[PDB]
Design a protein around this ligand. Structure first.
Ligand code: A1MCX
Ligand code: A1MCX
Lengths: 137, 137
């Protein structure tokens, strides 16, 4: 459970696409509703994630996602490698259903579920910080 | 320099709006190009930030930004208070100019500058994690 490994996958709900990144060692999640399942959307999300967390390698359950020239360039620029050493999408989907009524847009509902997921109990949010600070010291 | 304090401001470049959040104790930055300077854009950004970092209080140099019923609801939901105890927007603008040519869209350029800002040298990214893990332990 290395501190730099993330898993990226796209799931579907209400005819929309939700891109889910999981920090594998901690269970911490970053997720966003994207207009389309394209490389430009994937490339932009990776660039944003890498500027926020130390992202060393990325795994996926759909290898074809990392074929676009655009995603390769983002991984090139950010120094990210593909992971060769290797559920929550559904716990997230359960949390979204529980909070869907409180919000008009699904995107609002996804960020609320990401909040509840990462702050629920140590929390996934406390684990990622501990794991990364430990790796620093 | 409490670990839960963030400063949010909107800056302008190329006729677009960039929303910049600074973790005050560390100098770590989260920034995004938003289509418009509205409360719905501000409310969505706060909900996303709070699900990623422990956000206790938020300060701004434009108090009118926090007047919309929408932003108040996001702060209500996320348990965020307004800060009453209290530059980088320009170091970020310097980094964006240095990298603007490498990218077509300004939004791509902003995430690259956020990456360079947070990973430059201890780094702002290393400080925020240390500060928050220290506050946990
Ligand atoms: C008081 C008015 C109001 C509150 C919330 C703000 C949300 C903060 C988190 C809890 C739910 C709240 C619902 C909201 C409101 C008015 C319009 C919209 C379209 C939304 C939400 O959209 C955004 C977060 C703004 C992009 C949504 O999708 O409903
Ligand atoms: C090889 C093709 C290619 C690479 C980059 C991907 C970027 C990754 C980080 C360094 C610059 C790269 C430029 C790119 C490319 C093709 C089209 C666009 C429109 C973009 C960038 O847009 C997004 C990040 C995709 C939203 C941009 O705005 O140029």
């Amino acid at each position: 459970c290395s501190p730099g490994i993330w898993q990226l996958d796209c799931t579907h709900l209400e005819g929309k696409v939700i891109l889910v990144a999981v920090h594998v060692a901690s269970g911490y999640i970053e997720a966003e509703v994207i207009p389309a399942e394209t490389g430009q959307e994937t490339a932009y999300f990776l660039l944003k994630l890498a500027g926020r967390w130390p992202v060393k390698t990325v795994h996926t359950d759909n290898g074809s996602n990392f074929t676009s020239t655009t995603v390769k360039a983002a991984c090139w620029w950010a120094g990210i490698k593909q992971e060769f050493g290797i559920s929550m999408n559904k716990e997230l989907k359960k949390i979204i259903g529980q909070v869907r009524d409180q919000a008009e847009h699904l995107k609002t509902a996804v960020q609320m579920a990401v909040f509840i997921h990462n702050h629920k109990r140590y929390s996934a949010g406390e684990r990622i910080v501990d794991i990364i600070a430990t790796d620093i010291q």
